[PDB]
């Protein structure tokens, strides 16, 4: 009877977060990049999501620890809305215990969620597939096609095949492609920046918009302000380096990424970005007939040390289904830089290795059974 109760809850286990079938580099480093730059409300949300990622990786015991920390922050603050936000966390205990086999324990939290939901109940409305179609038709006629698309799409998830919803979704798709929906960016970003006056991430988003619109004096002034106030934030540094790359300056873009790489201990995702940029600048200097320069050497040596450091970093890592999946993605890029940097400049030192062992690890990644099981559950095509 407990199996039927679980699908009715709202938690990360009932939202289809990975519907696309495409996943990024493992989110361990992306989800919890920096924790000293956030407030209490954002800290609680991060820990709720971090438990879901860990559980898929197989570390059920560590998942409970991530949930407990978010439990403490929400309990510490006393507020009416804080009680409601607690419903997401209690949904994760029920799913994790039931999977882990502790069926008796999971019944306690299913009981507890019912009293909280009973006090704040709305006795004049409900949710069902039939109530999403009637709203979908009305939004279609009034001319809001984008909102009508999602009312039909969310109704098909409950009923996989339905001749009425399917007809409606095709009409909304046809109307949208005929005339695209308008988007407001500069108005919304300016309005949001006025409500939040101490946020610099929204500053570099607007400047990147203004650069493409045709104004650089406005854009460059905004970025110089943002970098001065918060010069040790990874999010701002990556966006700032992108702006200069779009503008046409590659020297300054390189320096900003090098600063960002030395910011946090979770610098694994940044390795792929920096490696590509050195390849682009070195290929450019061939066009300028600069086959040899103290400056051309001043770049080739740096690419030499980064390739060894990344390869050394990969080998010293615990083996997990998510680590193996992310390793295969970065293999094509790291290989291409290998022949470019070292095989051409000088014969490779045999005794230094860091190669033919890394390649051996790649072959073992494909044969792993645990990766195959994970992809089937997530329905990722091979």
């Amino acid at each position: 009877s407990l199996e039927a109760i679980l699908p009715q809850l709202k938690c990360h286990f009932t939202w289809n977060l990975f519907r696309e079938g495409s996943m990024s580099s493992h989110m361990e480093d992306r989800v919890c990049n920096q924790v000293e730059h956030l407030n209490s409300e954002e800290k609680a949300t991060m820990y709720d999501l971090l438990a879901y990622i860990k559980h898929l990786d197989g570390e059920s015991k560590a998942a409970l620890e991530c949930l407990g920390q978010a439990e403490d922050l929400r309990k510490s603050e006393h507020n009416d809305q804080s009680e409601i936000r607690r419903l997401v966390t209690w949904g994760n205990y029920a799913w994790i215990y039931y999977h882990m086999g502790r069926l008796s324990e999971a019944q306690a939290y299913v009981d507890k969620v019912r009293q909280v939901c009973q006090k704040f109940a709305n006795p004049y409305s409900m949710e069902c597939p039939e109530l999403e179609c009637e709203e979908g038709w009305t939004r279609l006629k009034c001319g809001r096609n984008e909102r009508a698309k999602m009312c039909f799409e969310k109704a098909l998830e409950e009923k996989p095949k339905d001749p009425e919803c399917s007809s409606g979704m095709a009409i909304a798709m046809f109307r949208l492609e005929e005339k695209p929906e308008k988007q407001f960016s500069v108005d919304a970003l300016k309005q949001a920046m006025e409500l939040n006056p101490q946020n610099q991430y929204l500053k570099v988003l607007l400047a990147l918009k203004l650069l493409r619109m045709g104004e650089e004096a406005e854009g460059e002034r905004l970025i110089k302000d943002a970098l001065g106030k918060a010069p040790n934030q990874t999010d701002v540094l990556q966006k700032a380096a992108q702006f200069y790359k779009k503008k046409g300056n590659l020297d300054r873009a390189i320096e900003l990424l090098g600063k960002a790489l030395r910011s946090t201990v979770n610098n694994s995702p940044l390795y792929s970005l920096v490696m590509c940029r050195y390849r682009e600048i070195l290929e450019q200097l061939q066009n300028k007939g600069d086959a040899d320069s103290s400056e051309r050497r001043q770049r080739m040596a740096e690419l030499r040390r980064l390739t060894m450091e990344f390869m050394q970093k990969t080998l010293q890592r615990r083996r997990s289904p998510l680590n193996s999946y992310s390793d295969l993605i970065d293999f094509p890029e790291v290989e291409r830089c290998y022949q470019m940097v070292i095989s051409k400049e000088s014969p490779d030192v045999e005794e230094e290795d860091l190669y033919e062992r890394y390649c051996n690890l790649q072959e073992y990644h494909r044969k792993s059974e645990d990766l195959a099981a994970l992809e089937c559950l997530l329905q990722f095509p091979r």
Binding site: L9, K10, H12, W15, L17, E20, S22, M27, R30, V31, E41, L49, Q81, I84, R85, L87, V88, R114, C117, P123, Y124, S125, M126, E127, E130, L131, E134, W137, T138, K141, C142, G143, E146, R147, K149, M150, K161, P163, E164, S166, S167, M169, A170, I171, M173, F174, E177, Q183, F184, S185, A188, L189, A192, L195, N196, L202, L205, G214, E216, G248
Partner: protein
């Protein structure tokens, strides 16, 4: 009073806030009913509910009650099994209308009925509250890859329920930025094919699949239109959509017969007259490019074209100058017809109307070309090009207008009348040059 507090919690057409940023109710009703007169509705209850809401907004309530009764009748007619679930919105409409009138007992009774149905069919664990609608969405921002469309909806719900909140506003702004940077790509071919195969006898998605795609199908695409007309001869949907499709076919003898059949249905409509004007115009322009030869029928075709265009213009446009955008077609029609005085009359009629900056600069470009071709003088043309370049909208007609200014710079060498206005032209062009080397 507690009555309004309870009424605020219902979900119906009144709460959904249908009309927004519409200068009048007349524009709303026209755009919903007359303009897309085709669609009608798959579910007949929506039209009656919308009409009842508009009628109440006008000031009449008995008509609203009658329309709502018709909506309930249609609901009972279509779905007998799910009559309880499907009737939930109309009860809210009764409650709101009765409360507006003053009979509170009926409003209370309908509220009790809604409460009973909700209590019988509700789930004990689920809840709806914008805090959860925000948590779902902060999860999506981190987890998503390229589909940012549901993030924006999740944030709009929370923002609508409680505005002026910094967190919801930040989420909405980020979603809008991400959607603007990389637009969502959607394709109707697979969805349309699936919709047809699941439920035949729809006789609408067939026509949409024909006109939108399957150009390679050719005669096979036309077969869909023939079968759609065969299955339902009384459907105005297929009738209007097939007639517009035949304009691409360039077979007016067939499209006009269909449009006459349609006019036999709704005589007062103006877009029926508009489509006939589009049908002669597309055929005569097609035959003007290379058919040549006797070139006689074209004068007649233009005559009926202009008469139908005027029969359009006399209605639904004198009231609102902006709508149908027909005056440009009228002007170019006279230009092809070689008659110029009514041509400038109608173009000046068009020019006085406000337009968005893009259409404005397009109008300036077109009339600059005209003022060049038909008039010996050049000062008016350079003035109108200056008028257009005064608009700072960035678009490809504006780039063509910069090319026009380069031409006028050549005409400075050719004609002496250009004088210092050419100096201002080259000043603007060197400003543009400074800008483009600034973009580097």
């Amino acid at each position: 009073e507690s009555l309004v507090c309870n009424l605020r919690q219902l979900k119906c057409h009144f709460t959904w806030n249908l009309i927004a940023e519409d200068e009048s109710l007349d524009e709303f009703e026209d755009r919903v009913f007359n303009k897309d007169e085709f669609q009608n509705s798959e579910f007949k209850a929506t039209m009656c509910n919308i009409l009842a809401y508009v009628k109440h907004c006008r000031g009449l309530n008995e008509a609203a009650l009658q329309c709502l009764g018709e909506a309930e009748g249609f609901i009972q007619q279509q779905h007998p099994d799910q009559v309880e679930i499907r009737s939930l919105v109309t009860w809210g409409n009764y409650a709101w209308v009765y409360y507006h009138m003053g009979q509170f007992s009926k409003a209370q009774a309908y509220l009790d009925k809604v409460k009973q149905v909700c209590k019988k069919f509700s789930s004990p664990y689920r809840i709806e509250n914008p805090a959860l609608d925000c948590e779902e969405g902060w999860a999506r921002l981190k987890c998503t890859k390229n589909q940012n469309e549901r993030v924006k909806v999740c944030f709009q719900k929370a923002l609508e329920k409680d505005p002026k909140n910094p967190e919801f506003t930040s989420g909405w702004a980020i979603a809008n930025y991400r959607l603007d940077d990389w637009p969502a790509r959607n394709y109707c071919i697979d969805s349309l094919e699936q919709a047809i195969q699941l439920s035949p006898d729809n006789t609408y998605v067939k026509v949409l699949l024909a006109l939108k795609l399957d150009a390679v199908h050719k005669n096979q695409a036309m077969a869909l239109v023939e079968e759609a007309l065969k299955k339902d001869p009384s459907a105005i949907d297929t009738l209007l959509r097939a007639a517009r499709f035949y304009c691409k076919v360039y077979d007016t003898d067939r499209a006009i017969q269909l449009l006459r059949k349609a006019l036999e249905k709704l005589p007062n409509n103006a877009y029926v007259h508009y489509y006939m004007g589009c049908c002669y115009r597309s055929k005569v322009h097609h035959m003007l490019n290379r058919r040549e030869m006797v070139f006689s029928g074209d004068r007649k075709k233009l005559e009926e074209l202009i008469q139908l265009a005027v029969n359009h213009l006399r209605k639904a446009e004198e009231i609102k100058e902006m709508l149908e955008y027909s005056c440009s077609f009228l002007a170019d029609l006279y230009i092809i017809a070689k008659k110029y005085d009514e041509a400038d009359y109608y173009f000046q009629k068009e020019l006085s109307k406000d337009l968005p900056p893009g259409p404005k600069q397009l109008l300036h470009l077109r009339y600059g070309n005209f003022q060049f071709f038909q008039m010996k003088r050049q000062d008016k043309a350079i003035y109108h090009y200056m008028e257009g370049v005064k608009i700072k909208k960035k678009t490809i007609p504006q780039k063509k207008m910069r090319e026009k200014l380069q031409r006028i710079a050549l005409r400075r060498l050719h004609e002496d009348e250009s004088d210092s206005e050419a100096l201002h032209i080259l000043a603007f062009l060197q400003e543009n040059g400074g800008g483009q080397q600034a973009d580097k």
